[PDB]
């Protein structure tokens, strides 16, 4: 295995907090982003 | 919105030890980094260090380099800075201000403070 | 490293379109970024340009950055207009900050 390889993970897990266009990335405690933005749609006569 | 403050400059006999604070309000504190940078009267403007988004990340320069110490407090939303054994050309203002990024190695800077004067002289 | 080099000041009348730049003495001029800064004579700085060619929020258009490669230099075309606008301005790439260059309006 990398000897360094889990290492890197830890610093790709926490550190985070880059401002780019879809906002501010910041991984949880196991993986997939968390804090994302969400719009609600409703269907109404069939449309969006 | 996003305002400064920086205190603690004064007169100051060489080889004595000063302490500036930088409180700052408005923004959230934790998602940015800041620098302080520092005039000349009558030159331009240079570089001294800057702090990471937390902590680690700390950029010094060459004439700086050990003689500073730059830390922050996230839980009271300020900058500290801490200076010994000064010398006779470092006699100028000092900038406190935020950066763009989360970091520092893009050396950004947005909405400056106002300045203080330190000075070291007999 | 390098030294940023810049004219020492300029000065023209009201009503007319200045370029100001600041040259790179060593090295590519755009293989690094270029900043901006217009600072009020006894005030503090302000962000007036930012990446190459990019307006921060609340500057009122009326402002272009130059990044052209020439004679490795980036320049402002800023157009005709004075009114009070007329104060020292610095370049910066990367820790190393410009001459610095103000503006005059002419009485």
């Known amino acids: 295995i990398w000897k360094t390889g889990p290492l890197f993970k830890r610093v790709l897990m926490s550190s985070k907090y880059a401002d780019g266009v879809t906002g501010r990335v910041e991984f949880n405690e196991d993986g997939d982003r968390k804090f994302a933005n969400y719009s609600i749609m409703n269907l109404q006569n069939r449309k969006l | 919105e996003v305002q400064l403050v920086e205190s603690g400059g004064g007169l100051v006999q060489p080889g004595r030890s000063l302490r500036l604070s930088c409180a700052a309000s408005g923004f959230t504190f934790d998602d940015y980094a800041m620098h302080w940078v520092r005039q000349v009267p009558g030159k331009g403007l240079e570089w001294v260090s800057g702090?990471?988004?937390?902590?680690?990340?700390?950029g010094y320069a060459d004439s700086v380099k050990g003689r500073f110490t730059i830390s922050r407090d996230n839980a009271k939303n300020s900058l500290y800075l801490q200076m010994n054994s000064l010398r006779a050309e470092d006699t100028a203002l000092y900038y406190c201000?935020?950066?763009?990024?989360?970091?520092?190695?893009?050396?950004?800077?947005?909405?400056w403070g106002q300045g203080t004067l330190v000075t070291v002289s007999s | 490293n390098f030294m940023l080099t810049q004219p020492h000041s300029v000065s023209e009348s009201p009503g007319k379109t200045v370029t100001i730049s600041c040259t790179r003495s060593?090295?590519?001029?755009?293989?690094?970024?270029v900043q901006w800064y217009q600072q009020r004579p006894g005030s503090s700085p302000t962000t007036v340009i930012y990446?190459?060619?990019?307006?921060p929020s609340g500057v009122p258009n009326r402002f272009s950055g130059s990044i052209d490669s020439s004679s490795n230099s980036a320049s402002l075309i800023i157009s005709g207009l004075k009114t009070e606008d007329e104060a020292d301005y610095y370049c910066?790439?990367?820790?190393?900050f410009g001459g610095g260059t103000k503006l005059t309006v002419l009485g």
């Open positions: 060593s090295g590519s001029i755009a293989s690094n970024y």
């Open positions: 702090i990471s988004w937390s902590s680690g990340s700390i």
């Open positions: 201000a935020k950066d763009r990024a989360s970091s520092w190695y893009a050396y950004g800077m947005d909405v």
């Open positions: 990446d190459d060619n990019q307006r």
């Open positions: 910066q790439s990367t820790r190393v």
